[PDB]
Every structure is written in structure tokens, then in C-alpha cells.
Subunit: 290 residues, 6 copies
């Protein structure tokens, strides 16, 4: 009976051996999809990342870290729901608790809008850093203020100006651009990165900010390195630009998330890049602290 628990186990991130009590890093999943209009399937993103992860080594070669000894847990997934507001509420209290207990939340989702709940838990020293191809700055979309095209908006409301940066941007609504409050966020385009490099904007954030929260909207990355994103936008960042950003900023991170790609639209390469960025986050941080 226990000899059976010893032989069989449910699906998990391979290196998340530690339970919650002992974990420095707490990986969890939020299967929410219900405001996405173009491609659907983000619901299934966490699970497919658990799938991809087996192909990965328990040791990170670039950083010289063994993830097996990094203290990761995987709680799994929350109930599927159709209600953005309930989903946001739950994220909020979950992120509170992890952070409160001296741990670092790593949230795997479907949609971007779950990040709103995370922002709600941010203290005043923490600044927000987004990777994204769109400014999610609409006042509302589809009669919902929590449509995943409003996340940058919701974040402004909660944090104020001189607090939020988003990088990769190359899709913006007119309604958004003409808004006065638009200038209250630092929007950095993919074209800017392609011209001046990534380190320049990584510098600005590393100077200005005591602590950070990193949210990765997968579609900021060019479709070539990430085909399965929910809303593809040509001319985007390189997977290495996002690696570099994470690499540099992870020592100051209170929390992390990866959102907005759909396992049903490719054969696994995107969920692979996702699982790998989850590695870069934990490995770069452990090297730093040693």
C-alpha cells in the first residue's frame, strides 16, 4: 500500500521533490483561459510544461546548479473556472501566502490576466517587469475590466506610475495610445531591443528597482522561437533576450510567471522553451547567491 506509493506517482515537475514546507520555490498552475478570443488552449499550458520538463536535465550547465537541490515544490493545478474575478481573487491570496512564508511563487498559467491577482499582493518596494508583444492597456475589453488585454491597466491602478515596465511591445490599440495615462508606463518595443540591445533596458530596471516581479507573456517572444502563443505577433524578441533579462534580474525577484501560450497549436517546442525559462530563473538565482 505504501510500497505502491513508492512505485506510482502523479504527474509533476520532475525536480519538484520537496513538499511545500521545505520549498524555497513553489510552482503551481492556473488553468484559466476564459477571456482569450483568438487561440484557445492556454488552459492546458501547465500540464504540457510538466510534460516537456522530463526531456530536461536536472542539472543546469550554464549556471552550474543542480535543480534537485534547489528546493522546488509543485502543488499542481487549481480548479478550472470560467470566472476571471474568482480566479484573480484566488491567485492574490495564494501569492500572499507563499511570499509571506519566505518563498518564491512560480505561477504557470493560461491567460495573462491572472497576473493581476499577483500584482495585488506586491509590496511598495517591488516593481513590475513584463515581457509582452502587446500593451495590455485597454480600459476594458468585451465588457470585462479583467479581460487579458487590460492587465497593464489593472496593474497601473494598483501600483501607480514609475513602477511598471513592459518589453517586446509591437501591438497597440489607438484607444490605448491616445490615453493620457499611457505615458505612466515604460513601454519598450521589440524594435528598440533589436536596435539598442537588451542589456540597455535591463540596466535601467536594475538601477531603479529594489525588488521585482517578473511576468512573461510568451507572445512577446517572436513566433519563430514560440509558435504556440495565443496571439502571434511577427518581429518579436529572441528567446535569448528573455533568458538574459531573467538571468540578470532573478536575484531581485519576489515572484515569477509564464503565460499566454497554447500547447494545442504546436508539437511541444514552445512548452519546452517555457520549461527551460523556468530553469533559467531558479538556476541563475542560486548561482548568484553563491
Amino acid at each position: 500500500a505504501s510500497e505502491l506509493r513508492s512505485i506510482f506517482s502523479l504527474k509533476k515537475i520532475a525536480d519538484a521533490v520537496n513538499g511545500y514546507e521545505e520549498a524555497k520555490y513553489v510552482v503551481f498552475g492556473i488553468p484559466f483561459d476564459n477571456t482569450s478570443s483568438y487561440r484557445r488552449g492556454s488552459k492546458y499550458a501547465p500540464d504540457s510544461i510538466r510534460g516537456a520538463y522530463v526531456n530536461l536535465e536536472s542539472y543546469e550547465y550554464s549556471y552550474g546548479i543542480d535543480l534537485l537541490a534547489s528546493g522546488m515544490a509543485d502543488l499542481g493545478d487549481m480548479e478550472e473556472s470560467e470566472d476571471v474575478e474568482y480566479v484573480i481573487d484566488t491567485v492574490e491570496s495564494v501569492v500572499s501566502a507563499v511570499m509571506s512564508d519566505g518563498k518564491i511563487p512560480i505561477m504557470l498559467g493560461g491567460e495573462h490576466s491572472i497576473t493581476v491577482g499577483a500584482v495585488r499582493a506586491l509590496p511598495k518596494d517591488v516593481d513590475l517587469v513584463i515581457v509582452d508583444a502587446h500593451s495590455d492597456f485597454r480600459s476594458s475589453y468585451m465588457g470585462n475590466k479583467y479581460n487579458h488585454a487590460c492587465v497593464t491597466r489593472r496593474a497601473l491602478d494598483l501600483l501607480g506610475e514609475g513602477r511598471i515596465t513592459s518589453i517586446g511591445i509591437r501591438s497597440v490599440s489607438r484607444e490605448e495610445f491616445e490615453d493620457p495615462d499611457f505615458r505612466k508606463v515604460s513601454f519598450i518595443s521589440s524594435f528598440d531591443v533589436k536596435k539598442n540591445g537588451i542589456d540597455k533596458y535591463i540596466e535601467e530596471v536594475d538601477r531603479k528597482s529594489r525588488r521585482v516581479y517578473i511576468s512573461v507573456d510568451m507572445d512577446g517572444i517572436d513566433p519563430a522561437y514560440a509558435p504556440a502563443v495565443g496571439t502571434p505577433e511577427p518581429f518579436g524578441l529572441a528567446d535569448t533576450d528573455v533568458r538574459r533579462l531573467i538571468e540578470r534580474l532573478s536575484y531581485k525577484a519576489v515572484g515569477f510567471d509564464i503565460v499566454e501560450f497554447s500547447p494545442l497549436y504546436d508539437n511541444g517546442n514552445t512548452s519546452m522553451l517555457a520549461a527551460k525559462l523556468l530553469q533559467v530563473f531558479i538556476a541563475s538565482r542560486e548561482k548568484y547567491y553563491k
Copy 2:
């Protein structure tokens, strides 16, 4: 921390609420693939069946049973291995234990050859009932006696004549047919079923056998109702023939298994039929005992 175990959970069959201790039905998964030459992916079958299952109702309408109150557990999956012999050994001891403890093993696999381990645990009153498009009767295949094209062979060696029946058969090797021992198994073709019906051969088994073990090689079923099978064979059984067989024989079953289909070769309809047959098995049996 416990409020978290209350919100998050790892992937499972939805109705497998009960732990091992309280379960009448013990679902587990065996991710083995390593002798399959044509299509690969059975490794991933159990997981995809967990996936499909959510679309299903917790109540069975045809049998009037609520699976939530049927006492199912899901232990999960065993370690992936390349070694048929190790995999077979482990299956053997697992099946022993469940049966020994008054419970009914329900094994989700990749390859058929894992059934060999199950047979090894069968008492003398139990007879074997297979659904399959091939006689897996080769003496050996690819320098392995445990190649999944030898399962009917291995089963003969263990059980003797007048013990094994396989239904759906429409692919047979010459080497197999010319073997003297071939007649020691009751091979029933799909063509026979299409002519005389299924109930006829279900009758023969229900008369002759005190108890049974049911093993479903998914490819016995016609490709139309099951596209993702590992080795497709046209002109095969109807999904309802297999339903009917299970429906009728489940009250005498000591154990069950579903094998030989690959989630990567279709969009989920096959793993759906699989998950549904898992239902028909438990529901038809609970109705009988009431």
C-alpha cells in the same frame, strides 16, 4: 500550507477520490512503449486518458451508477523504463497485491506486453479474455520473447489450453498459424463477430469460466472508432461490441486493462473511448451487484 493542498492538486482521474486503503477499484498507469515498432506514443496513453476523463460525467446514465461513490483510486504512473522484463516483473507484484487485498486492478498502459505480468498473477479458476486484431502468438520477435507480438504466447505458457480467448483477430503471421500449439487458444475473428454477432462468443465465455481477466488491445476495434491505435487493422470490431463484452462479463472480472493506442496520432477521440470503456467496466459491475 494545507489551505494550499486544498486549492491545488496533481492530475488524476476525476472520480478517483478515494485513496488506496478504501478503494474497491485501483487505477494505475504503466508508461511502456519500448517494443512497438510501427507507431509510438503509447507511453503517453495513461496521461491522455486522465485528460479525456474530465469531459465525462461522474454519473453513468445507461447503468444508473455514480462513479463518485464507486470507490476508485488513482495511484498514477510507474517510472518509465526501457526494459520489458523489469516492467513485466513490477506489473506482476502490483497485480498480486491489489487482488490479494480484495481489490480490482485497472491497468492503463502503453504496450500490450505488460499484460504478461498480469497473467502471471492469475489463479487457476480465472480465464483470460483478450480483445485484439492480432494473435500475439509469435514464439519471439526482435530477439525478445516479451515483444508485444508474443503476449498470447507468453499467456499460453503460463495458463495452458482451454483458458484463453481472443476476439477481433484479423492479422496473423504464417509462422503463427502453422504452429501446432496455435489451436490451443480460441481465436475469434472480427469477421465471425460481424456475421454471428458478439453475444454468441460472449455466451461461450460466460458459460465456461468461473472468473475472468479482461485485456483490451485497442486495435481490435476498427480504426473508425479508434484511429490512434499503434497498429491499425481495417475491418475490425465496433466500439459497441467491446462495450457489450465488458457490460456482460464485468461481474466475473478479477482485473482489467486497456493498451496499445497512441495519443499523438489523433486529437483525443481514442483516449475518450478508452476512458469511456473504463466507465462501462465499473458502472456495469456496480449495477450487477445491486
Copy 3:
């Protein structure tokens, strides 16, 4: 400029050569999708049906009817929305308007929930005829009484006992089976049909009803024939069982809708089946009024 309109045209059903005024059958799409919790994509089915239509002939062989002279019209799609109530309200209006004008509404939708709007606009002497794998009889699903899992409950409230029949049903939640009002609807299982034939249940309707509305939730059909449906359920009707029903009730029908299949889950076959069901409705009816 007018010689251009004669050289280019927008995507249409190739036999819908008549404008509204001069039409007997009015074809329109509803790209609504937003309560489907398994497979998503319904939204795109109208477009795809138009696409499949090109492979069909103008002359339906089995009825000596030429569809190019059947008075068909194609109005395209209604703007996408996330609001169920609002979508239903609009449907109610379009449907009422069209029947008032002595025309017949062929509604190509996404979800089944749009059928509610059609039900609202129905005269005391029209009964509802549904093909479906599920009873769709929930009082409410996922915080909503217009969830597509409720379309039959909603039909009941509008129409009362002895007006609604649903064929193909094999998936029922227990809450629905136990609700007292369940029996006020003639629920016919696919098992009943495979056993007693389809004509038996057709006779039961042709007798008891002066006029009808036909709703095809495409999953009533076995996944062998409609693999692209939103919620597959094995052991279903044959495509020829549905053809037969349409063939037989087409002369009494006031309207007709087709729902619940995501064209993304296959390579065209399902939407071809949907396009052929369309061509059947219009040819069997006209053949009649010859």
C-alpha cells in the same frame, strides 16, 4: 467598378445566389462559442461549412432537386460577442423576423446555446426536435443558466411537457436524472436507436406534431462520423440516422440549426457532413413541395 463586382465576390455558400427578399431558405452564422468548456472552435464552423460547400454539387442526386433554384440566401456572420444573453436576444429577433416573412432560418452556429433564441420565437403548435449526445438538462452550469449544458432545461421552461424530443442521448449528469421535470421530455438513447432503429422514433414525432424545429447538436453523431465535435461521446448515431430524420421531418420544419463542432479538430470531414445535412434539409423539403 461594377465590372469589378462581377469579377470578385466575398465568401458565400455557392448556391445561395438570392438576396433576402427573394429567398425561401435563409442561411446565417452565429460565431458564438463562449460557454464551451472542453473543445473550442465552434465559432469558426460557419466559415468552414462555406469552405466545405465548394466540394458539393449544385444538384442533389437523391431528390432530383437543383439547389441553385431552391431560393437560398447567405447573410454571413453576426459580430462576435462574449455575452450569451445578448447573443440569444439577437437570435430571437432574427429568427422571429425570418419566420414572419414566411422564410425558413438555417442557423449555422458554434454552440448549442443559440438554439434558445430560436425556441423563444416558436408558436404553440411547433414541437422541438433535437439530435444530441447529452441531455443538456442542468438548471445552471458554471454560474450560468444559459450555459450550453442547459439548452434543454431552457427549452422546457419555454415550451412545457410533451413538446420536446431529443435523440442520441448517452451522457447524463445525475442531477438531471433526479430532477422531477426530467420525464417531461422524451429522451431517446442512441442504444434505443441502434436496437429499435431510428424510424420508430421518427414515426412518434411525425404523428404527434403538426410542425417542428430541428436542432442538430453534432455530437449526437458518433465520433466515427463527426470527430470534430466539441464534446465527443462514443456509441452514437450513424450520420445516416440523422439524414433519415431530416429526410422525414423536413416538410414540417419551420427552422433548422447545426451546432457544436470545432473545425480545428479535423481536416474538413465534419464540416462536409454539416454541409451535406444542409443540402438534405433543403432538397428533401423541396422535393416534397413538388
Copy 4:
């Protein structure tokens, strides 16, 4: 040097072991497609059939015939060409030739219009038996008489009345149905079959004809069994219906072909049925000659 030819071989039908001269059954591909409108990819069918064959046993259980010892050869594929007339003319020579030598041509194709070729080669006693969802009976299509929707018409031009049957049909253009010549061919609807059984229509042909040529347009079968046909038509024949047709008629068959499916549109199940249907033709024919000769 020659040890290498012993280790490596080009791709073919695994049982096609003999050279042409020693072969009874000569399997060959014609990758032609350039008249097909709706789904394209027929060109690759013969290759995909060779690939699926590996999954099949060399011995056919239901006939008790070992295909390895049934005198099969595989010539491979013909060059691709955009010209219909050029292919049809090429087929005709290849069909005539193989029949002269008392061999049995099995033509794996793309489109159905390659069949026209084979029909030019037929003696007066041979009748044509077609499995198809449409009456490819159209005077012309897209400024082409040899367009793959006109195959039946071009067949009637060659054979005349009472020589041609086509089974499974369920899609007909009024221009064909209104032709006086339409009744000069036997058309059996997939609905006929589903109502009267296939055997009835098999019985008629067997009694009437002394020899046949069998042409299988893969879309005559219901899309559930052949999902990857070039022009799908629901409410078709059962995969078993076509098997029974072949089982019962292969002993009189002078030639055979399989056409109009496209491997790009599924994961292999359609080319697997196509390969099985080819086993069935050879095997059931060998069963006849082992029993009655």
C-alpha cells in the same frame, strides 16, 4: 562492393520480391494529380502505400495465402508530369504490355483519370467495375475531357453500353443525370447497397461478365474508413463492402487499381486500408487458383 547491395535497398512493397519477368502481379505507381481541385496530394499515395505495407503481415489469415510466394513485383513510380494526355497514353502502353505477358497490373495512382489509360487496353469480353462516390461522368471539366471528373464518360466512349458498372455513387451533377447516355451505365447508389446488401450487386456482375477490370475510387468508401480521400462524401460504403466486392471478383480480374486518396490528410489509416485492399485482391485471387486450378 556487392556486399552493399546485400545490405541496402530502395523502398518498395515488402512482398514485391520478384523481378518483372517472374512476376504474376505487377504493382506500379503513377503520381499524377494535375486535375484535382479540392484536396491535393494524390501524387504521394503510392509512396505512402509502400510505407504502410510494412505494418501488414506477409501472410493473409482470411485466405490462407502467403503473399511472399504469390509472385509480386514492384516497378516503382513514373516521372511526374503536368500533362493528362501524356500520362493516360503512358498508362495504356504499360497496361497493354503487362496484359500481353499474362501478368496482372495493379496500378497505384493519384487521380482517377489514370484509369482511362487502362480502359483503352481492355479486350471486348472484359467489363469494368468501379467503386466511387461520384459518377465521374461528365462530358468535360475545366476545359478538359480527360479531367478526373469525366473518367466514366471517357469509359463509355471506349466500351459502349452494358460494359460498365459503378457502385457507391451518391453525388451527381444534373448535367450528367439529364444526359440520355447516363442510363447506358449501371450506377448503384451507396443507399442501394446499404438497403439491399452489396452481394446482390456483386451477383449481377459475376453472372453478366466473363472477365473484369476493377477500379476503386477511394472516396466511394465512407469517410469514417477512408478519411483522407480527395473529395469526401458522407453516407458511403463500408470498408468491408469493398472487400467483399474484391474477394468475390478477383478471380475474373485482369487488372486492378486504387486511386483518389491523399496521405497528407490523415495519419496513415487511409493508406493502410489501401494496402490491405491490395492484399485482399491478390490473396483472394490466389485462393481461387489454389482451390480450382
Copy 5:
């Protein structure tokens, strides 16, 4: 009755709001394919482009141009035809016509051979700028002069020397390379670009030509960015390289087209780049006329 036309509409480019008469930019599809050998499905490109466009914003951030107020119209698609000459002749009339009215034709196609049409309509001052992985510069292919591998050749026949440039090329048949006439066209290799930057070659064209027509053969782009092109060729141009080409040249452009990709071969990313490239042409051109007129 008329309330219904207010609720329902046929599918088109979401921003193509104006009728022809009031339009500056006239977008139209030509679903023609019947010369394409390797991957097929170009026919469906224009439809798939309209479908991806829904994912794009009506306002283009990098140019500060609202497309809804840029005078776009969408005529829809032309009948399908199997005849190359017939389509090319049809295009030529449609291109001439739209240019006469001082409008700007945006031709969404399948194959590249539709471009020939548009080239017949060009005035003497207009030069042709082609993005392509091959030199579709072949005297004939498969007994066809208007075969889609001969587009460049037929272009030279019409314009003569110094009038034509083609960028990104990395696949050439020796029969072309050995032609004396090969040097009468400017061919810039994708390797040239990757070495010297795209701007260099953009500078040359801008200085030389007073006006241009831009033809984008989608396979000139590296398969990483356009996976679903009809004839993929690795080591291609960056998606950004083509954007820069358009950005910089759309103010002189009398016409534009996008061709030779097939939506059947991916999940939408290629038609999404195709739709973005069309936004880029219109937007960057409007930016010029808002700044300098």
C-alpha cells in the same frame, strides 16, 4: 429585411471598410495554384489572410496610422480557374483599371505567376522589386512559359534591362545561371543581405527608380518566420528584412502583392506575417503622405 444586412456580413479584411470608388487601397484575392508542384494550397491563402487579420489591431503602433481611416476596400476573390493565361489576362485588366483610377492594388494570391499580369500594366518609369528565394527566371517549365518558376523571365521580356531587382535568392537552376540574359536582372542573394545588411540594397533601388511595384514571394523569407511557404529554402531573409524593404519603399509603390504560401502547412503564423506585411505597406505609406503632403 434591411436590419439583417446590419447584423450579418460576409468575411473580409476587417479594416477594408470602403467601397471601391472611395478606396485608395484595393485589396483583392486571386486563388490560383495550378502550376505549383511541391506544396499545394496557395489557392486558400487569401481566405486565410482575412482570417488572421482579426488578430491584428486597426492601429499600427510603429507608424501612428489608423488603418480604419486609410481608405481600404476588399473586393473578395476571383473564380477559380485551371488556366494560367486566363488568370494573368484577368489580373492585367484589374491592375490597369485600378491604377487608372489612381488607386493602389494589393493583390493577395496563391502562386507567383499572377504577378506577370500586374507587370504588363506597368508604365515605363516603374521598376520591379521582388522578394524571393529563387530566380523564377526560366524560359519554360512543364511545357509552360507562364509556369510560376518563369515569372522573372516573363518580367524581363516585358521591361527589359535595368528595370528588375530580386532579393533573397539562394536557389538557382544552372540553365538560368548560364543564360546570357541572367545578368540583365539584379539578383541579390540572401547571403549578400546577411553580410551587408538589407539597407544597402534598399538604398540602391531608392536612388535608381522613381516608382516601384513590390512583389513578395513569401518563400524569400527564412522558413523560421514563414514555415508554410510552397517551396521552403533554408538560410533566408529575416521577417524584419522584408518589413524594412516595404517601410522604405511603399511611398513610391504603385502596387503590391503577396504570394506563394500555403495555410494548410501551419497553424496560422505564416498568414499572420502575411497580414502584418500588408499593414506595414499601407501604414508606412500613409505615414509618408501625412508627413510630406
Copy 6:
């Protein structure tokens, strides 16, 4: 009968018009696959490369070389086997025989493990050059020392220090990093290449080595360019980095293999890249010996 052989032919590389005797480059396939534990399908890559080849021209533009007159040969495939050792033994023989005859072996395989056989047949003055994402330096994997995760360990045993260089490496298990013998191989990261360029590492080989063998494990290339590889790893080489290496070492090379990509995981692009790498090897070399 002989006029038939002139009209039909079996699947071949369209420029391999010469028989063995008259050939300088000998192209052969090894459909071996049976130690790959993630994606399976390598086995089919030779066939697919032949298929992609049809889209290529006979004349390679960038080298003024006509491949129809380069003395190429295509021998087809070796019978499938499940035995690694045996496959390797056969490879060893074919490779030795071919180099002895002063011919160059282009081996199109499935797995990387076949390269071992080629390594066995190498003279004291030929160094090994590998493109790969992983170090492949395990002493043994999954109960086997000829697992494809070991191909570099096995290379070392045969060749000793200062003879083996591997470029693109970004995935290393810790056991390999810690083994003392690790440093006896020149391991070049894809990060090193993106930073310092590729030419730097090419110079390092062109100098230190008289002659070489080139092995392309296709996953060394970033999933953007070879999405169909057996084990994807993000942050990799550009396809042009590999082209460059081949361009530069082709004149010293004694053999050349291409491995580790399953054609099932894409729609042709990877095998096109593999076919183009083939055409590069043969054109860059010949251009040279002009």
C-alpha cells in the same frame, strides 16, 4: 521489361544517378531509432530527406557546382533492427569499406548512436567534429553504454584526448560535468558561438587537424530552424552556423552523417534543412577540388 525499368524507378535521391562503382559520395540510410526516449521517428528521416530532395535544384548556386555530375550514389536503407551493437557493427563495416574504396560516406540515420560505428573505422589522423545540443557524455544510459546519450563517451574511448570537438552544447547532466575525463573533449557552447561567432571555433579545428569526420546531431540547431528534432533545446545555433562549418571543413572531411530528427514532428522543413546540408557538403567540397 527493360523498357519498363526505363519508365519506373524506386525512391532515390534525384541526383544520385551513379552506381557504387562510379561514385565519390555514397549516400545510405540507417533506420535505427531504438534508444531514443523522448521523440521517436528518426527511423523515417532518410525516406523523408529523399522526399524533400525533390524540391531542390540540381545546380547549387553558391558554389557553381552541378550535383548531377558530382558522382553521387543512393543505396537505400539497411533492414530495421532493435539491436544497437549489431547496428553499430554493420555501420563500422560499411563505413570502413567505403573509405577504403576512396569514397566518402554520407550516412543519413535516425539516432546519433550510429556515429560510433563510423568512429571505430577512423585513422590516427582524423579528428571528430560534432554539432550537438548535449554533451552525450554519460558512461551509460538506461542499462546501455551504446545509448545515444553516450555517443561522445564512446567516441573518447576510441580516440583519446585532443581529437574531439562538439559545438552548440547547452545541455549537460552533472555526472558528465563531474567525470574527470570531461575536459579531454573540446566542448563549445552555443552561447560561446553567439558571442564570439562560429568562425573562431572553425579556425581552431582547421588548424589542429589534417582530416575530419563531421557528425550533425540536428538538435544542435535551434528549434526555430530544426523544430522536428528528437530532443529540442532552446538557445541554439543558427542553421547558417552549421552551413558555415560544413562550408569550411568539407575539403578535409572523410565522412559525414546527419542524425536525430523525427520527420513526424513537422511538415517537411527540418528534412529540407537536412537535404540542404547534404547539398552543401558535396558542393563546397567539389568547388574546392576544382
